[PDB]
Write an enzyme that holds these catalytic residues in place. Structure first.
Site, PDB file in Angstrom:
ATOM      1  N   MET A 107      -3.291  -6.440   3.185  1.00 18.23           N
ATOM      2  CA  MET A 107      -3.521  -5.822   4.491  1.00 18.23           C
ATOM      3  C   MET A 107      -4.291  -4.525   4.322  1.00 18.23           C
ATOM      4  SD  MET A 107      -2.632  -6.822   7.553  1.00 18.23           S
ATOM      5  CE  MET A 107      -1.096  -7.738   7.321  1.00 18.23           C
TER       6      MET A 107
ATOM      7  N   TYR B 272       9.992  -3.896  15.774  1.00 14.02           N
ATOM      8  CA  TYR B 272      10.291  -2.528  15.403  1.00 14.02           C
ATOM      9  C   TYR B 272      11.592  -2.084  16.050  1.00 14.02           C
ATOM     10  CZ  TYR B 272       5.438  -1.921  13.698  1.00 14.02           C
ATOM     11  OH  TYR B 272       4.271  -2.049  12.982  1.00 14.02           O
TER      12      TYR B 272
ATOM     13  N   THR C 130       8.295  -3.060   3.750  1.00 14.30           N
ATOM     14  CA  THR C 130       7.898  -4.480   3.716  1.00 14.30           C
ATOM     15  C   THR C 130       7.853  -5.053   5.137  1.00 14.30           C
ATOM     16  OG1 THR C 130       9.212  -4.843   1.653  1.00 14.30           O
ATOM     17  CG2 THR C 130       8.539  -6.812   2.865  1.00 14.30           C
TER      18      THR C 130
ATOM     19  N   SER D 221      -2.401  -5.636  -2.424  1.00 11.18           N
ATOM     20  CA  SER D 221      -2.305  -5.575  -0.955  1.00 11.18           C
ATOM     21  C   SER D 221      -3.014  -6.727  -0.280  1.00 11.18           C
ATOM     22  CB  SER D 221      -2.902  -4.280  -0.384  1.00 11.18           C
ATOM     23  OG  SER D 221      -2.716  -4.234   1.026  1.00 11.18           O
TER      24      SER D 221
ATOM     25  N   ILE E 157       0.822  -1.196   0.000  1.00 13.50           N
ATOM     26  CA  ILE E 157       0.000   0.000   0.000  1.00 13.50           C
ATOM     27  C   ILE E 157       0.857   1.248   0.000  1.00 13.50           C
ATOM     28  CG2 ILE E 157      -1.696   1.417   1.250  1.00 13.50           C
ATOM     29  CD1 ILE E 157      -3.215  -0.912   1.938  1.00 13.50           C
TER      30      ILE E 157
ATOM     31  N   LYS F  69       2.476   0.626  16.941  1.00 15.35           N
ATOM     32  CA  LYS F  69       2.728  -0.438  17.927  1.00 15.35           C
ATOM     33  C   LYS F  69       4.082  -0.342  18.647  1.00 15.35           C
ATOM     34  CE  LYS F  69       0.461  -3.680  15.475  1.00 15.35           C
ATOM     35  NZ  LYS F  69      -0.122  -4.820  16.191  1.00 15.35           N
TER      36      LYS F  69
END
Ligand code: NA
Length: 355
Positions: A181, A145, A75, A179, A12, A117
């Site tokens: 998601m 992350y 990604t 996509s 996206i 998150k």
């Protein structure tokens, strides 16, 4: 001079970067651009078929890309456990930086996309109070992350003048043809099915989502945010939130979605928590009929109706973030979320994902 490597071009955000970068008036321009993804197929962009999680295929495909100056990392592997999310996503990130950094003498900047998150723990304080801010300490819980940032930071030392930026969106409103998601796509397919079956667009979510304040993060604005950091000195070696600059309630967005498909809008039903996965169980044949009756792109429901994702978003409270730092550092981009929502619905229709 200015050469982008979009890592995840079929996603996206990848897609927004893909469309915006080559445009004549785009900051940093004119851009040459590479788009990388796992799929074959499918125009100004130089497409590279590469599986990032394969050390050989990344070495083979990315090393020859001698001229790249900016990489946009967009990604993500999504795994059953967070420990696996780390092993998987780190390996991928490392594989790209190990193929690029040594072979690109004009590499100026790697731009890493993570998400909100960053601020959110498992449950299970320990926690943070919204609206979320960028430089308050990391939560004590495992988070891929954090691992990605540390890799980035470590790898930035091995070349002088190399800068970085982290980009942390909330819930993304966007489009791509492939996509897996897509919230907006998913809601379009639910709406389309309700229209087909002559049913009301029943609200599939919690009360905090219906009646509380929520925000979201536009795919194109996120792309602009990435671009901004590429070119702005005040954006360098900084992490930043990206959200739309406004606030909304699903109560009202549900009516907008209803209006866009000509379907009766449902209201908040007390006494449950209603799930998309449940309502759309067994709709695979119904969707195929809709695709056939209308001249749609031939899709399977599981690829366009991502219910678990939509439920994760509509069944929980939206904790807001802060755009202060982005603004302070010179990014004044915004979007009117209701209009953007209509715009991404229109885009799903224009590509015949949905009627
Ligand atoms: Na938009």
């Amino acid at each position: 001079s200015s050469v982008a490597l979009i890592v995840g071009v079929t996603g996206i955000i990848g897609n927004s970067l893909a469309e915006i970068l080559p445009l004549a008036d785009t900051p940093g321009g004119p851009w040459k651009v590479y788009g990388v993804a796992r799929r074959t197929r499918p125009n100004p962009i130089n497409y590279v078929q590469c599986d990032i999680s394969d050390p050989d295929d990344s070495q083979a495909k990315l090393s020859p890309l001698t001229d790249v100056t900016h990489v946009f990392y967009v990604t993500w592997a999504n795994r059953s456990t967070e420990q696996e999310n780390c092993e998987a996503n780190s390996k991928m990130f490392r594989n790209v930086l190990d193929a690029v950094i040594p072979n690109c003498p004009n590499l100026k900047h790697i731009s890493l996309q993570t998400g909100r998150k960053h601020y959110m723990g498992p449950f299970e304080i320990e926690s943070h109070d919204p609206p979320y801010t960028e430089d308050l300490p990391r939560l004590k819980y495992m988070n891929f992350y954090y691992d990605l940032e540390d890799i980035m930071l470590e790898e930035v030392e091995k070349k002088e003048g190399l800068t970085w930026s982290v980009h942390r969106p909330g819930n993304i409103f966007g489009f791509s043809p492939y996509s897996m998601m897509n919230l907006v796509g998913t809601l379009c397919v639910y709406a389309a099915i309700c229209k087909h079956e002559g049913k009301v667009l029943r609200f599939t979510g919690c009360k905090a989502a219906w009646d509380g304040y929520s925000d979201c993060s536009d795919a194109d604005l996120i792309a602009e945010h990435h671009i901004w950091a590429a070119v702005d000195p005040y954006a360098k070696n900084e992490a930043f939130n990206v959200s739309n600059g406004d606030v909304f309630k699903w109560k009202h967005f549900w009516k907008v979605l209803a209006e866009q498909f000509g379907v009766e809008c449902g209201e908040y039903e007390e006494g449950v928590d209603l799930k998309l996965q449940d309502l759309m169980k067994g709709k695979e044949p119904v969707w195929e009929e809709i695709v056939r009756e209308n001249g749609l792109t031939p899709t399977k429901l599981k690829d366009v109706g991502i219910w678990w994702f939509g439920d994760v978003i509509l069944g929980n409270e939206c904790f807001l973030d802060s755009m202060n730092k982005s603004k302070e550092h010179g990014f004044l981009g915004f979007r009117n979320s209701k209009n953007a929502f209509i715009s991404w619905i229109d885009k799903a229709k224009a590509y015949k994902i949905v009627p």
